[PDB]
Write a structure and sequence with these properties.
The structure is a homodimer. Chain A is mostly beta strands. Helices cover 4% and strands 33% of the residues of chain A. In chain A, strand 25 (450-452), helix 3 (459-462) and strand 26 (487-489) form a beta-alpha-beta unit. At the A-B interface, strand 1 and strand 6 of A face strand 1 and strand 6 of B. The structure holds a molecule of 7 linked components (NAG-NAG-BMA-A1H0P-MAN-FUC-FUC) (2 copies), a molecule of 7 linked components (NAG-NAG-BMA-MAN-NAG-FUC-FUC) (2 copies), a molecule of 6 linked components (NAG-NAG-BMA-A1H0P-NAG-MAN) (2 copies), a molecule of 2 linked components (NAG-NAG) (2 copies), 2-methyl-5-oxidanyl-cyclohexa-2,5-diene-1,4-dione (YKK) (2 copies), chloride ion (8 copies) and 2 more. A molecule of 6 linked components (NAG-NAG-BMA-A1H0P-NAG-MAN) binds next to loops of chain B. Chains A, B: InterPro entries: Cu-oxidase-like_N, Cu-oxidase_2nd, Cu-oxidase_C, Cu-oxidase_fam, Cu_oxidase_CS, Cu_oxidase_Cu_BS, Cupredoxin. Chains A, B: Residues 71-181, 246-350, 484-605 form the Plastocyanin-like domain.
C-alpha cells in the first residue's frame, strides 16, 4: 500500500463531512454495507506553547485564535505537549469496521510516549492498547511507533497519552466510531451527528502537570484546575463571572432551528473535578454512555468525570438566538469566590444575538429537572436524579452474564495511605512515593493496601522475562495480598478466559467529596449497583449480598467503561472476560493512577491472545552480574 | 560479588574522608600502589520538590535546611528532578583505577533517562557513555540500568542527565578521580584536597527547564537564570544585594589558617551564562583544567562556563575571619538592577566573624589582577588576562600530535537559523523546531547550516539497524553537507583510528555576547588557538593558516574537554583519535544542544571498539509494512 494515499486531515469542516471532496476521507456519514476504509494518521508529539508565534494577536484579534497551529486555551502562556500543534489533538472520525493506522513520532525532549485508545476493545490487537510496561514498551524520543487496529466497537471513544502526566499537558483527543444512521440503535433520535459536535470538556492548569507532582506544600498544594475549556478555549473567571485572564472568546456550538443534533461529550478532565453540564432552555436526550447505546432518557443536566463520555441530543426547538452552555465544576475549591466553571454559546444559524449578562458559577440551567449521574448516587424515589445503574442498554445480554451467578467476584477497597498518620517517611534514607493534596495531606494511593507499581517489561509480550517475585503474592483466599501502612507490587488478578466477573469497588478512605472514576481497559461492563455506605455496612457485606442474590438496579443495565464511585460509597460492575490479555483497571483521575490506584486483570494465558508481532520493541532492566 | 558490601554513601564528612571507618569507603586519600576498589552507587531518579516536607521550617530554621532529603536551592518552591533527593546529586569521590558501578533506577513519570560521565574517556566501555541514540537506548520509567566502567583518567570530572532538559531540573553532580598526593603532578601545591571543597556552581531558574522550551514569547522569553547556587544553596538577590527571596543561608567554605586547600570548581551551569569567580583577599593558584594538570598560574579571578572545571589552590594565609566568595554572572540580563550573581562565605576555623555589608553585583574581588579564561580572549600583551591557549600542560605530548601536520582538519561554523529572517514557518502544516530567546528571536541551532537530529537507534550498538539515509551525505569535499535556511540530519564525521585531528570552531552568527562552550566526549584535546574574528577574516582562512603553519599559542598547550569560544571568534583544538566509537561534539549550553548545536565523530569501524555487551538494550522505530 501507499499509506500516504489514506492520510487523514487533522480537522474536517461540517461541509467536508456532509459532502466529502475525497473518496478516501474517513470522517463521513457511514453507508450500510459499504467496504471499510483504511484511515492513516501521521502524528508528531512536540514540546509546544499556548499563544506564542502561531497565535499572532489572539485574543485581542479573535480570528488569530483560529490559526491551525495556535493553541489558545485560557490565554495564559505556558509550556504544553501537543499532537500536531492542537489541543485537543486531532479527532479520529471513522465508521465501524474501518482500520486505524497511526504513525506516532515522539519529538518530546527527555520524554517517553505511548497513546491509549480509551474504549477501543483491541480484541486481536492487544499489543496496540498503549499502556507502558503492560502492552508495550514506551516510545523513546527520536523513534516512531505505528499503531494498527480496527474500529470494531461503536461509539464516542477517546485517546490520550498513557505515559506519566502528559495528558493534562495536552496529549488527548476524541475517537468517534459512527454507525450508518439507519443501523444505529438510536439513529431515529437525531437528524445530524457532525464532527464539530464531538466536544471535549477539558480541565486546565496554568502550570505544567509535572509542576503539581509531587506538588508544592506551601504555595500551591494539590492538583486543582483553574478553569475548563470546551474544545480549545475558554476564559478564566471568578465565581461571579468576572474575568481574571485574557478575554479568550467562548466556544460556539452551532445548531439550526427545527433539527435535532447528536452532541458527543467527552470527559477530557484529568483532575479530580467533575462537571455538571447544562444548556439554557434546552433539555438533553441521553442516547449513549461511553459509546454504548441506551434507551433514551431526557434530563436537564448530567455530571461527567475523567474518562466518561455521554451522547445527548439537543432539539433546536427554542426561539432562535444565543443560549448559554454551563459547565459547573464539582469539587472543593480554594474559596466560594474562586469556584471553577466555564461557559460556551449555543448559537442558532441565521442569528447574531449578543448576551449581555455572564452567568455565574451558581447560574447553571439544571432548573430542578432530572440530573443524570448525580453526586452521591442521589437517585432514589423522589430525589430528582437518575443513576447510571438505573439506565437500560439498547442491546440485550448476548452471553448469559446477568442471568448466571458470577464465576469470579473481586472486591477492591481503593483509597490513600496518609503519611502524616504514621512515622515520618522523610530524611531516613528511603524513597516512598507521595503527592501533596490541597489540604496538605501527604498521600500514596492504594487498592487493598497495595500501591500499584509497574513490572520492568510488558507482560503481554515479555511475560517470560519478568521475575515472578514482582507480582503481589496470592494468599489462601485466592486473592493478591502484600508480601507497614501499605506495600508496593504488581497487583495482578488472573481470571480464566470466558469467566463471568463481578467487581465491587469501594471508597474506603473517603475525602473531599471525591467520586473516583474507575476504568477497565479492553472491555465495557454492566453497571450492577451503586450507592453510599451506611455506618456498620462493610464493602465485604455488600459484595457478598450482591453475589448471593444476583441483585441489579436495572433488568438490563447500561454498559459503561468508566464508573464514578459515589463519595463514601461503592459501585459493582459485571462483564464476560472473553477478551484475552493484560487489562488495566484504575482510577481515571491522573494523579491517582500516577500514585498507584490501579490493578491489572490477566484474562486467559499466553497462546489465548495473538503471538507477539515480528520486531515488536523489547525492554527491561540491564543489570549484568558483577564479577572480579 | 555481593555488590551491597561495596555500596558508597551519598555524602562523606571531611573527618570520614581523612580517617575512614570502613575499608570499602572509596572517598579517601589514595595510597600509591594500593589495590583498586569497587565503588557501588545505588541511585533513584525521582520527581521531587524544593523545600516541602523534608525541609521543615527551612530557612527560618537554618539547621532544617541541612536535612539529608531537603533541597533548599534559593528557597523558591518548584518541581525538580533528583538523584537520591539531593541537588547537586551524590558525588562520586574515588581514586584513579577504581571501578565505578552505578545502579540507576528511573522513577520519573513519563520521562526516559541516561546519565553521561562528563570527562571520563570510557576507552573499552564506550557503551557506558550515557548518550541517548548514540551509545545506548534511554532507560524507560520503571527500569534500572547498571553503568560499569573504570576511573582510568584523573581529575575533576562531572555527571549529568544527557536526556532532554533534566540537568537544569537537578540531575547533576561531581566525579573526583584523585591520585595519591605523592604522584599527582601538582601534589606539592596544596596540603588538603577534601570532598567538601569539590564545589559545583549551579545556575537556577524558578520554573522547570521544560517551561522554557520552546519558551514563552511575551511573558518570559529565553532561558536566563535568576540566581546561582554554590552546591545546594544561595538566596535570590538584586544587583544591589537586596534579597527578593527567602533568606536562604549563603554556602560556607571552611579553611584553616596556614594550610593550602585544593578547590575543585565545576561549571554546573546549564544556561548561556558564564560566571567570574573571585575570593576577597585570596589569590587563586590554578593547577588543573577539566581534570588535566597544568603548570600552576596565580590569578585573582577566573571565568567558567557550562561543562568546564577549574582546580584552584586557596592559601589560607590572611587574617583569620570571614571572606566573601563572589560569583558574577556574565551575560545579558533583563536590566542593570537585575544582574545575576551569588555569594558564599570563606570561613577560617576558630572564627565567627559576621560580615555586615553584602557585596553588590559589581563588588567582586578581581581587583585589576589577572583573569583566567577572559571574555573575548582578551589576553594579548598588556591586557591582564590569561587565555586557556596560553597555559602549559604538566604532561608532555606522548603521541607526536603537536609536532606533526594534522591528518584531519574539520571546520565547524556554529550558530542559529533565525526564522524571522525567512518565510513564516507556522500555520502551514509543518513542524520546524524552534526556541524563543530573550530578545524574542525564534531560533534553531546549526553547525555548517545543519541542525543535528538523532538516529532512531544508537549506532555504537545498532549500526546495522540504521538506514544510511539518516546521516548527512558526504560531498565531493569529503565533508558532510545538506541533502532552505537549514537542513536536519545525523551530522556524522568519520575519522580513522589513530588520526591526528584538528577542529576549528567559529561563532558565525554572533549574538548577545555568547561564549559557546564546545565539549568533545571520549577525549581531552590541546587548545591550539583562540581569538576574535577581524572583519574580512573567514573561518576558512584561519583554519587553512593554522593547518599549513602548525601555529600554537603555547609550546605545550593545556588539555581541556570543554572550550568557551570567544564571542564573534573561534577556537582550534587538536587530539589523537585513539579511542574508537561514536563521540558527541556539541555546545554544552543545554538549550543549544536541545536545538541541534552538535555533530558526531565516528572514530574507527565496528570491531575497533568492543563487541556489544550481552543483553544490551535495543531500540528503534516500529513501522511494520501495511498490506490489504
Ligand atoms: C456526598 O457525600 C459526602 C459524604 O457524606 C458522608 O457520608 C454519607 C454517606 C452520609 O452519611 C453523610 O451524612 C456523611 O456526611 C459529603 O461529604 C461530607 O460532607 C460532610 C458535611 O456535610 C463532612 O462532614 C463535616 O466535616 C466538617 C469538617 O470536619 C473536619 O474539620 C473540623 C473542624 O476543623 C474537625 O473538627 C473535624 O474533625 C474534621 O477534621 C465538620 O466541621 C462538620 O461538623 C459540623 O457539622 C456536622 C453536620 O454535618 C455536625 O455533626 C457537627 O457537630 S459536631 O459533631 O461538630 O459536634 C459540626 O457542626 C462535618 O462533620 C464530611 O467530612 C464530608 N466527607 C467527605 C468524604 O468529603 C458530600 O458533601 C459535600 O462535600 C463536603 C466536602 C462539603 O463541602 C459539604 O458541604 C458538601 O455538601 C456529599 N456531596 C454532595 C454534593 O452533597
Ligand atoms: C565581546 O565582543 C563582542 C563582539 O564585539 C564585536 O566584535 C569584536 C571582534 C569587535 O570588532 C567589536 O568592536 C564588535 O563590537 C561584544 O558584543 C558586541 O558589543 C557591541 C557594543 O560594544 C554591540 O554593538 C552595538 O549594538 C548596539 C545595538 O544594536 C542593535 O540595536 C540598535 C538600536 O535599536 C540597532 O540600530 C542596531 O542595528 C542593532 O540591531 C548598537 O546600538 C551599537 O551602536 C552604537 O554604538 C556603536 C559603538 O559601539 C556606534 O558605532 C554606533 O554609531 S552608529 O553606528 O549607530 O551610527 C552607535 O552609537 C553597537 O553597534 C554588538 O552588537 C555586540 N555583539 C554581540 C555578538 O553581542 C561584547 O560586548 C559586550 O556585550 C554586548 C552585548 C554589550 O552589552 C556590550 O556593552 C558589552 O561590552 C564583548 N564582551 C565584553 C565582555 O567586552
Ligand atoms: C487578525 O488576524 C488575522 C490573521 O492574521 C494571520 O494569522 C495570525 C495568527 C498571524 O500569523 C498573522 O501574522 C497572520 O497574518 C488577520 O487576517 C489576515 O491578514 C493577512 C494580511 O494582513 C492576510 O494575509 C494576506 O492574504 C492576501 C490574500 O491572499 C495576500 O495577498 C497577502 O500576501 C501578500 O500581501 C501582504 C500584504 O498584506 C504582503 O505583506 C505579503 O508579503 C504578500 O505579498 C506578496 O504578494 C505576492 C503577489 O504577487 C504573492 O505572490 C506573495 O506570496 C506575497 N509575498 C509573500 C512571500 O508573502 C497575505 O497573505 C490573511 O489572509 C488574513 N487571514 C485571515 C484568516 O483573514 C487580520 O487582518 C485583518 O483582516 C484581513 C482580512 C486583512 O484585511 C488585514 O489587512 C486586516 O488587518 C487581523 N486583524 C487585524 C485587525 O489586524
Ligand atoms: C530546627 O529544626 C531542627 C531539625 O528539625 C528536624 O528536621 C526538619 C527538617 C523537620 O523534619 C523537623 O520536624 C525535624 O524535627 C530541630 O532540631 C531537631 O529537633 C528534634 C526535636 O524537636 C530532634 O529530635 C529529637 O531527638 C531526640 C534525641 O534523640 C529524641 O529524644 C526525640 O525523640 C523523642 O522525643 C520527641 C520530643 O522532642 C517526641 O516527640 C518523639 O516522638 C520521641 O519520643 C519517643 O521517645 C522514645 C524514648 O523512649 C523513643 O524511643 C521513640 O523513638 C520516640 N518516639 C518516636 C517514634 O519518635 C527526637 O527524635 C532532632 O534531633 C533535632 N535535630 C537536629 C539536627 O538538631 C530544631 O529544634 C530545636 O533544636 C533541637 C536540638 C531541640 O532542642 C528542639 O527542642 C529545638 O526546638 C529546630 N529549631 C527550632 C527553633 O524549632
Ligand atoms: C493561572 O492559574 C493560577 C493558579 O496556578 C491563578 O492564580 C490564582 O489567582 C487567584 C485569583 O486572582 C488568586 O486569589 C487571589 O489572591 C490574592 C492574594 O492572596 C494572598 O494575600 C492575601 C492578603 O493580601 C491573603 O489573605 C491570602 O491568603 C494570600 O496570602 C487575594 O488578595 C485575592 O482575594 C481577593 O479577591 C477574591 C476574589 O474576588 C475575594 O474573594 C477576596 O475576598 S476576601 O475577603 O476573601 O479576601 C479578595 O477580595 C478583594 O478584597 C479587597 C479588600 O480586601 C477589595 O478591595 C477587592 O476589590 C477585592 N477583589 C476582588 C473582589 O476581586 C484572591 O484570593 C490566587 O491566590 C492565585 N493562586 C495562586 C496559587 O497563585 C491565576 O489567576 C491564573 N491566571 C490566569 C490568567 O488564568
Ligand atoms: C523566581 O524567578 C522569577 C522569574 O522566573 C522572578 O520573577 C522576576 O522578579 C523580578 C524582581 O522582582 C521582576 O522585576 C520587577 O518587575 C516589576 C513589575 O514589572 C512590570 O510592571 C511595570 C509597571 O508597573 C513595568 O514597567 C514592567 O515593564 C513590567 O511590565 C517591576 O515593578 C520591578 O521594577 C522595580 O524594581 C526594580 C529592581 O529594583 C527597579 O530596577 C525598577 O526601577 S525602574 O525605574 O527600572 O522601573 C523598579 O523600581 C521600583 O520603582 C518604584 C517607583 O517606580 C519605587 O517606588 C520602588 O521602591 C522600586 N523598587 C525597587 C527599587 O526594588 C521589577 O522590574 C521580574 O518582572 C520577574 N520576572 C518575571 C518573568 O516574573 C522571581 O522574583 C523569583 N523568585 C524568587 C524568590 O527567586
Ligand atoms: C488494609 O489495612 C487495614 C488496616 O489499616 C485493614 O483494616 C483493618 O482490618 C482489621 C481486620 O484484619 C480490623 O480489625 C481493623 O479494625 C481494620 N482497621 C481499619 C478498618 O482501620 C483492611 O482490612 C485492609 N484491607 C484488606 C483488603 O485487607
Ligand atoms: C551556510 O549558509 C550560508 C548562507 O546562508 C553560507 O554563506 C554564504 O556562502 C556563499 C558562498 O557559497 C556566499 O556567496 C554568501 O555571501 C554567504 N552568505 C552569508 C555568509 O551570509 C555558508 O557558507 C554556509 N556554510 C557552509 C559551511 O557551507
Ligand atoms: C485525599 C485527596 C486526594 C486528592 O486528590 C485531592 O485533590 C484532595 C484530597 O483530599
Ligand atoms: C541568539 C541567542 C541565543 C540564546 O540562547 C540567548 O540566550 C540569547 C540570544 O540572543
Ligand atoms: Cl474533526
Ligand atoms: Cl484475541
Ligand atoms: Cl493552576
Ligand atoms: Cl465523610
Ligand atoms: Cl561527598
Ligand atoms: Cl576500545
Ligand atoms: Cl526563572
Ligand atoms: Cl557583533
Ligand atoms: Cu483513558
Ligand atoms: Cu482505557
Ligand atoms: Cu481516584
Ligand atoms: Cu488506563
Ligand atoms: Cu557534560
Ligand atoms: Cu561529555
Ligand atoms: Cu551554544
Ligand atoms: Cu554531551
Ligand atoms: O486510561
Ligand atoms: O555533555
Amino acid at each position: 500500500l501507499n499509506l500516504e494515499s489514506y492520510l487523514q486531515p487533522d480537522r474536517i469542516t461540517r461541509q467536508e463531512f456532509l459532502t466529502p471532496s475525497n473518496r478516501n476521507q474517513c470522517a463521513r456519514e457511514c453507508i450500510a454495507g459499504e467496504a471499510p476504509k483504511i484511515c492513516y494518521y501521521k502524528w508528531i508529539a512536540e514540546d509546544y506553547v499556548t499563544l506564542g508565534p502561531a497565535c499572532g494577536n489572539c485574543p485581542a484579534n479573535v480570528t488569530a485564535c483560529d490559526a491551525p497551529q495556535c493553541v489558545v486555551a485560557n490565554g495564559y502562556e505556558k509550556s504544553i505537549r501537543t499532537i500536531n500543534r492542537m489541543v485537543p489533538g486531532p479527532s479520529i472520525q471513522v465508521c465501524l469496521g474501518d482500520r486505524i493506522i497511526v504513525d506516532l513520532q515522539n519529538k518530546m525532549a527527555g520524554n517517553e510516549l505511548a497513546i491509549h485508545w480509551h474504549g477501543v476493545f483491541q480484541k486481536g490487537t492487544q499489543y496496540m492498547d498503549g499502556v507502558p510496561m503492560l502492552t508495550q514498551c514506551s516510545i523513546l524520543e527520536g523513534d516512531v511507533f505505528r499503531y494498527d487496529f480496527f474500529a470494531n466497537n461503536e461509539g464516542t471513544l477517546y485517546w490520550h497519552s498513557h505515559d506519566g502526566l502528559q495528558x493534562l499537558d495536552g496529549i488527548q483527543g476524541s475517537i468517534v466510531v459512527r454507525k450508518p444512521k439507519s443501523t444505529d440503535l438510536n439513529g431515529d433520535t437525531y437528524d445530524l451527528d457532525v464532527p464539530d459536535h464531538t466536544l471535549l470538556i477539558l480541565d486546565w492548569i496554568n502550570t505544567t502537570a509535572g509542576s503539581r507532582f509531587p506538588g508544592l506544600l506551601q504555595r500551591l498544594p494539590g492538583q486543582e484546575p483553574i478553569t475548563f475549556l470546551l474544545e480549545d478555549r475558554g476564559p478564566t473567571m471568578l465565581s461571579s463571572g468576572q474575568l481574571i485572564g485574557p478575554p479568550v472568546p467562548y466556544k460556539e456550538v452551532w445548531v439550526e432551528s427545527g433539527k435535532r443534533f447528536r452532541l458527543r461529550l467527552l470527559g477530557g478532565l484529568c483532575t479530580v473535578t467533575g462537571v455538571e453540564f447544562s444548556i439554557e432552555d434546552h433539555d438533553l436526550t441521553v442516547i449513549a454512555t461511553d459509546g454504548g447505546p441506551i434507551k433514551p432518557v431526557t434530563v436537564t443536566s448530567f455530571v461527567i468525570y475523567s474518562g466518561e463520555r455521554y451522547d445527548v441530543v439537543v432539539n433546536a426547538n427554542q426561539n432562535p438566538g444565543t443560549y448559554w452552555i454551563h459547565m459547573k465544576g464539582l469539587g472543593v475549591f480554594p474559596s466560594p469566590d474562586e469556584e471553577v466553571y466555564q461557559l460556551a454559546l449555543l448559537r442558532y444559524s441565521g442569528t447574531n444575538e449578543e448576551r449581555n449578562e455572564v452567568p455565574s458559577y451558581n447560574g447553571g440551567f439544571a432548573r430542578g429537572g432530572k440530573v443524570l449521574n448525580p453526586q452521591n448516587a442521589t437517585c432514589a424515589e423522589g430525589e430528582g436524579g437518575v443513576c447510571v445503574s438505573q439506565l437500560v442498554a439498547s442491546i440485550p445480554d448476548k452471553h448469559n452474564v446477568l442471568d448466571r451467578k458470577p464465576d469470579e467476584n473481586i472486591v477492591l477497597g481503593f483509597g490513600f495511605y496518609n503519611y502524616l498518620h504514621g512515622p515520618n517517611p522523610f530524611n531516613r534514607g528511603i524513597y516512598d512515593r507521595f503527592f501533596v493534596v490541597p489540604d496538605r495531606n501527604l498521600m500514596n494511593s492504594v487498592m487493598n493496601n497495595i500501591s500499584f507499581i509497574a513490572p520492568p517489561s510488558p507482560p503481554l509480550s515479555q511475560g517470560r522475562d519478568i521475575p515472578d517475585d514482582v507480582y503481589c503474592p496470592i494468599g489462601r483466599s485466592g486473592f493478591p495480598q502484600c508480601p507497614e501502612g501499605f506495600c508496593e507490587c504488581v497487583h495482578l488478578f488472573r481470571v480464566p478466559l470466558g469467566a463471568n466477573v463481578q467487581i465491587v469497588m469501594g471508597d474506603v478512605t473517603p475525602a473531599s467529596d471525591l467520586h473516583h472514576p474507575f476504568h477497565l481497559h479492553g472491555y465495557d461492563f454492566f453497571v450492577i449497583a451503586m450507592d453510599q455506605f451506611r455506618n456498620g455496612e462493610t464493602l465485604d457485606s455488600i459484595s457478598s449480598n450482591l453475589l448471593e442474590t444476583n441483585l441489579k438496579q436495572s433488568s438490563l443495565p447500561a454498559r459503561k467503561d468508566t464508573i464514578a464511585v459515589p463519595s463514601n460509597g461503592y459501585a459493582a460492575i459485571r462483564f464476560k472476560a472473553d477478551n484475552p490479555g493484560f487489562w488495566f483497571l484504575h482510577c481515571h483521575f491522573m494523579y491517582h493512577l500516577a500514585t498507584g490506584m490501579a490493578v491489572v486483570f490477566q484474562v486467559g494465558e499466553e497462546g489465548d491472545w495473538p503471538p507477539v508481532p515480528p520486531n515488536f520493541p523489547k525492554c527491561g532492566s540491564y543489570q549484568p552480574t558483577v564479577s572480579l
